[PDB]
Ligand SMILES: C[C@H]1CCC[C@H](C[C@@H]2Cc3cc(O)cc(O)c3C(=O)O2)O1
Ligand SMILES: C[C@H]1CCC[C@H](C[C@@H]2Cc3cc(O)cc(O)c3C(=O)O2)O1
Ligand SMILES: N[C@@H](CCCC[NH3+])C(=O)O
């Protein structure tokens with residue numbers, strides 16, 4: 001035990017020595033007849049101690065436990081694609097002509113990738129194993145690997161260690177890819193049409209980069225909203241894009257400078273459809289992934305009791321202003337940026353011991369107030385926070401009966417935002433910035449139909465569905481300090 | 483012949499006037515019962531002049547011709563607006579409608595005496611006005627790229643072009659997933675960035691200058707090490723470099739990495755995947771392609787496997803009456819190549835490294851050996867190819883391939899190099915290789931060039947929706 005991190009020294013040597021002896025310890029091809037998970041699937045049902053000696057198979061995996069037993073009989077745990085089988089290497093069954101048994105297995109360390117030629121069977125004890133007549137070294141593992149339960153900050157830097165050791169890690173990311181596919185199939189079913197828009201435009205704080213043979217400073221997209229709308233105008237009535245978006249700001253458990261987003265835009269759809277949409281999409285994904293609508297989620301971390309979140313539609317809808325009003329014994333007279341009212345809000349913020357932001361714009365004052373009182377109204381369910389004001393919501397179309405508000409929604413899971421959508425604004429005159437892009441503004445003048453449109457935070461969604469407290473856990477190689 | 487300046491102003495006025503009259507010319511919702519393409523599909527088979535007057539339908543589209551022509555989702559139907567049927571003033575409710583306007587109609591389906599399939603309005607609402615005058619059909623420059631929504635609205639080919647792009651991508655995603663691959667997302671921004679100049683940007687609350695990925699190769703390999711034996715990613719990659727017909731600073735790529743697969747597997751792969759996509763999209767393996775532009779006769783490109791394979795060195799050698807003795811970066815040989823470049827009147831690059839000298843020589847002689855078929859250019863040397871594993875029988879070469887269509891590169895792939903000692907890059911990636919990368923084959927596709935050929939376009943600008951233009 002306790003190797004002095006000289007394993008590398010004594011492996012890097014061992015490699016060169018293998019080259020010196022005429023051997024190639026990194027051979028080009030190994031023609032395999034079967035993947036581990038297939039192996040398990042087609043031999044799960046053998047009787048303890050039954051060998052199929054007339055079946056010669058070629059298999060590959062990574063060694064993960066070199067157990068030894070006798071001298072003329074040696075074990076190994078072999079893994080591939082998230083699964084394990086045993087190897088039982090018997091001096092008796094070993095094809096001697098190719099090589100001396102002891103010296104063909106004395107070589108194999110933990111981590112090594114091997115290629116075995118064997119027959120399938122079960123041990124007396126009933127462990128399903130491969131039985132090698134021959135074992136080739138395909139790609140050595142030069143370093144000592146962490147033991148099971150070995151894992152820190154190393155997970156994120158070196159994901160390949162997480163994926164190799166912690167059976168949950170693999171699951172976590174297999175779930176991410178599921179979700180994304182589910183959604184793509186969800187949307188394509190409904191007739192939507194995936195496109196790609198530009199990552200860099202000419203205009204949240206942005207990431208700014210230069211194009212050398214262009215002499216123009218460009219900007220990494222803070223979102224996918226604008227071009228898609230320009231495409232609705234193009235006459236792609238149902239259009240979406242899944243993909244990375246870049247926001248220069250603080251990093252924390254629910255914040256990464258680059259993150260995956262989906263936005264779809266559905267011509268001829270009002271706010272009500274997007275609520276029907278969201279309730280239908282969330283529930284179905286959750287049912288798809290767990291067979292039940294309810295799930296468990298360790299909000300306060302895995303050392304603390306989980307909570308149960310219930311995705312059965314419908315979900316609640318809360319009117320942001322009416323709640324803050326209700327909950328503060330207060331009226332918030334319009335317009336919100338009026339003098340009288342901003343003070344009334346700052347008065348509230350301080351008097352409930354909460355952090356004032358600078359600038360104190362009514363838009364930001366609302367958001368804070370919301371994020372204190374309302375956002376954690378329900379953890380045990382997802383719910384919507386609807387009808388935000390126009391001065392929070394400048395692409396959101398003016399609500400049709402209620403003055404001052406828009407027809408917008410935001411779905412919240414356990415305090416955090418994961419969907420944001422609204423009846424789009426399509427009337428160029430009402431766009432206060434247009435009287436944004438010169439290009440986008442113009443399009444609106446070519447005539448945007450009534451449209452509803454919706455945005456999802458892929459990672460936060462993934463986070464909840466994979467019981468992670470950090471967004472760093474559900475991204476494969478998050479951006480770390482050096 | 484109207485002026486476009488005032489047209490905007492007179493419509494902008496017309497909107498305000500509508501609001502003054504209590505009318506809302508941008509109404510929130512119109513509950514439609516049917517899409518145009520559905521309308522066509524469920525009434526294609528009416529007799530000329532037959533009305534189904536007891537069927538009241540709600541439909542929407544964009545007006546495109548006053549005589550009215552109505553379009554939605556790439557298709558057109560007629561509108562016939564009759565005093566006979568109008569729910570009562572008719573003239574003043576339709577004198578209002580301009581070309582471009584989006585409307586919502588309440589009508590019944592039927593055919594004109596002449597057999598044109600149409601909707602018949604009792605009522606027509608203005609849903610979203612078109613404030614500008616639109617291009618006449620067959621009146622469309624640089625405007626296509628800046629304002630794509632005009633291209634998509636007028637030129638029935640444009641829509642096709644992009645519908646094809648999204649097809650291809652889906653075909654490939656289903657192609658790969660079928661075979662067991664596992665889509666992932668890697669980072670767009672790395673600490674250290676193929677051989678290409680990078681886009682460089684700063685993270686504010688990290689206080690650090692990061693690099694837009696020039697490719698997806700490295701992390702995927704680090705994932706192979708992770709034990710995702712079949713892994714792929716489709717997505718944008720950023721290269722600070724020249725723009726032209728087959729070049730955009732940002733472009734879509736797909737790279738998959740296939741553990742335990744040799745270089746040959748990737749040939750089988752590519753020949754499969756190309757042929758099948760081509761068969762999938764056109765029903766035949768052969769396509770037509772206006773290489774020299776649409777004013778010039780097309781050529782026929784034949785995707786029936788197998789495709790040819792050409793040994794880069796052996797060809798340049800063969801074609802130049804020349805031996806190119808190893809090592810290539812030797813003194814004697816570089817000269818022998820520069821001698822060749824000048825003496826066949828071709829542009830020398832600086833630096834004159836043997837790696838670049840090869841590439842040029844290749845791109846002149848070999849790359850246009852076949853236009854009428856796709857073909858492979860295999861076994862590049864190690865000094866061109868530093869992630870490519872050393873070819874197993876031939877010294878000096880690697881086990882690499884590159885599929886070329888009509889002179890242009892669209893696939894690049896090799897038996898990966900997995901032996902850290904032989905690697906002459908990220909401290910992170912290197913390290914992974916020391917944890918032990920199995921034999922793996924891996925492959926890269928240029929989504930946009932592939933699209934370009936399959937959609938008969940001379941420019942890569944045509945198959946990207948909003949290409950990056952100068953203002
Ligand atoms: C496209 C929108 C749609 C609503 C859901 C989501 C809202 C937030 C935004 C965000 C910002 C940011 O700076 C770092 C993030 O990680 C996230 C994130 O995951 O979700 O993304
Ligand atoms: C994934 C790789 C594999 C070879 C096929 C293709 C090669 C080039 C890449 C490239 C570079 C560049 O700086 C500007 C580009 O437009 C393109 C492009 O789209 O074609 O993509
Ligand atoms: N751009 C929005 C998502 C789309 C909302 C509806 N247009 C966001 O990032 O929140």
Ligand SMILES: N[C@@H](CCCC[NH3+])C(=O)O
Nearest residue numbers: 697699894895924925926
């Ligand atoms: N990174 C390569 C594609 C993968 C080739 C095989 N590892 C390129 O951009 O050409």
Ligand SMILES: [Cl-]
Nearest residue numbers: 745746874875
């Ligand atoms: Cl070979």
